[PDB]
Scaffold this motif. Structure first.
Motif, mmCIF file in Angstrom:
data_model
loop_
_atom_site.group_PDB
_atom_site.id
_atom_site.type_symbol
_atom_site.label_atom_id
_atom_site.label_comp_id
_atom_site.label_asym_id
_atom_site.label_seq_id
_atom_site.Cartn_x
_atom_site.Cartn_y
_atom_site.Cartn_z
ATOM 1 N N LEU A 118 0.921 -1.045 0.117
ATOM 2 C CA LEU A 118 -0.087 0.206 0.152
ATOM 3 C C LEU A 118 0.772 1.256 0.037
ATOM 4 O O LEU A 118 1.727 1.432 0.995
ATOM 5 C CB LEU A 118 -0.872 -0.066 1.080
ATOM 6 N N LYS A 119 0.864 2.006 -0.890
ATOM 7 C CA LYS A 119 1.492 3.190 -1.249
ATOM 8 C C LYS A 119 0.799 4.377 -1.008
ATOM 9 O O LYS A 119 -0.436 4.755 -1.516
ATOM 10 C CB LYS A 119 2.127 3.475 -2.729
ATOM 11 N N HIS A 120 1.416 5.385 0.037
ATOM 12 C CA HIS A 120 0.718 6.627 0.381
ATOM 13 C C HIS A 120 0.346 7.600 -0.766
ATOM 14 O O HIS A 120 1.129 7.634 -1.967
ATOM 15 C CB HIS A 120 2.014 7.531 1.023
ATOM 16 N N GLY A 121 -0.685 8.031 -0.672
ATOM 17 C CA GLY A 121 -1.389 8.934 -1.531
ATOM 18 C C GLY A 121 -2.196 8.218 -2.832
ATOM 19 O O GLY A 121 -2.827 8.784 -3.502
ATOM 20 N N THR A 122 -2.124 6.806 -2.643
ATOM 21 C CA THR A 122 -2.544 6.080 -3.980
ATOM 22 C C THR A 122 -3.963 5.481 -3.556
ATOM 23 O O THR A 122 -4.349 4.530 -4.308
ATOM 24 C CB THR A 122 -1.723 5.094 -4.432
ATOM 25 N N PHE A 123 -4.110 5.548 -2.325
ATOM 26 C CA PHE A 123 -5.686 5.011 -1.939
ATOM 27 C C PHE A 123 -6.276 5.969 -0.697
ATOM 28 O O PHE A 123 -5.582 6.573 -0.320
ATOM 29 C CB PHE A 123 -5.252 3.532 -1.593
#
Ligand SMILES: CCN1CCN(c2ccc(C)c(C(=O)NC3(c4ccc5c6c(cccc46)CC5)CC3)c2)C[C@@H]1C
Length: 305
Positions: free
Chosen positions: A243-248
């Protein structure tokens, strides 16, 4: 020696009806099934301290029936008792404010409820049942006992039973106003489908909104042509995931086995936050077993020819 007290009865806690109760008889003897802040009082007899208090009593007259339907959007006769039964526990739960959001300290397998409550504060949902609208506004502020007891009642779940987060959202989504929501999909000769309502915003099979847009293998390639909704919910069986910050917006972590595990909630804010009930950790990158991801949306149209 006939003593009496005055109480109020209600099915919705908005319309109060005044009652005189014989202190010699049980509430059940006078009202039928009767509750006080959750606690069933049907075989107990009025107390002095009871004067003035509001009492929930299952709708027995067509007036209470109408008031009841108008508040809950259900006619299920068991609903009120289930809500009251659930409410008798959730009122003992604690609801910490973790990260500016309202959570639940773990109890009776409520991790799933916590995760849905957190999610429901992060996405744009208009409930049609007034009960849910009123319960949700209070839960936003920090008092989430009633919203939680309603969620169990609508989803026919017992306290102590671990539920599935995707299934709950689905139930709730069906009591919310998602009529304007539209989804267009194309399969590839080319076979295009149009979805509306809850089916517009939900998908089981991949966690990635980008994959859904790029192209998903199926039993051929399915791909998103058009999304018209405030959010989309991407679900899939639990699987290791970065899970990558800003992408969800947020995501459901499930550790454990089918119907016997544990949910955590991940939120992308200034960084990735892991809200585990009352506990909170912070990491810039997150990798773990994920089964639901939420992404905010307004309008999206593919560029694929
Ligand atoms: C109406 C039929 N309903 C079937 C699912 N039931 C249920 C209840 C509680 C939980 C925690 C889960 C569950 O554990 N849900 C997850 C899950 C975990 C593990 C696997 C899953 C798979 C498919 C899909 C989800 C999975 C394959 C392996 C976490 C999403 C399911 C509810 C109901 C009886």
């Amino acid at each position: 020696e006939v003593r009496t007290i005055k109480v109020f009865t209600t099915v919705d806690n908005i319309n109060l009806h005044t009652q005189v109760v014989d202190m010699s008889m049980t509430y059940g003897q006078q009202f039928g099934p009767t509750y006080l802040d959750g606690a069933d009082v049907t075989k107990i007899k009025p107390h002095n301290s009871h004067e003035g208090k509001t009492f929930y009593v299952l709708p027995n007259d067509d007036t209470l029936r109408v008031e009841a339907f108008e508040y809950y959007h259900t006619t299920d006769p068991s609903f009120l008792g289930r809500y009251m039964s659930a409410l008798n526990h959730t009122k003992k739960w604690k609801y910490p404010q973790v990260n500016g959001l309202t959570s639940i300290k773990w109890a009776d397998n409520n991790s799933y409820l916590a995760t849905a409550l957190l999610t429901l504060q992060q996405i744009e949902l208009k409930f049609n049942p007034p009960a849910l609208q009123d319960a949700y506004y209070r839960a936003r502020a920090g008092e989430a006992a009633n919203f939680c007891a309603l969620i169990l009642a609508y989803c026919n779940k017992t306290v102590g039973e671990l539920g599935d987060v995707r299934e709950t959202m689905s139930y709730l989504f069906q009591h919310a106003n998602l009529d304007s929501c539209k989804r267009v999909l194309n399969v590839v000769g080319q076979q295009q489908t149009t979805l509306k309502g809850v089916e517009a915003v939900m998908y089981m099979g991949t966690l990635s909104y980008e994959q859904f847009k790029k192209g998903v293998q199926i039993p051929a390639t399915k791909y998103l042509v058009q999304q018209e909704s405030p959010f989309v919910m991407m679900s899939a069986p639990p699987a290791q995931y970065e899970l990558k910050h800003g992408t969800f917006t947020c995501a459901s972590e499930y550790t454990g086995n089918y119907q016997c595990g544990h949910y955590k909630h991940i939120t992308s804010k200034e960084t990735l936050y892991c809200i585990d009930g009352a506990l909170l950790t912070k990491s810039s990158e997150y990798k773990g077993p994920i089964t639901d991801v939420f992404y905010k949306e307004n309008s999206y149209t593919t560029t694929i020819k």
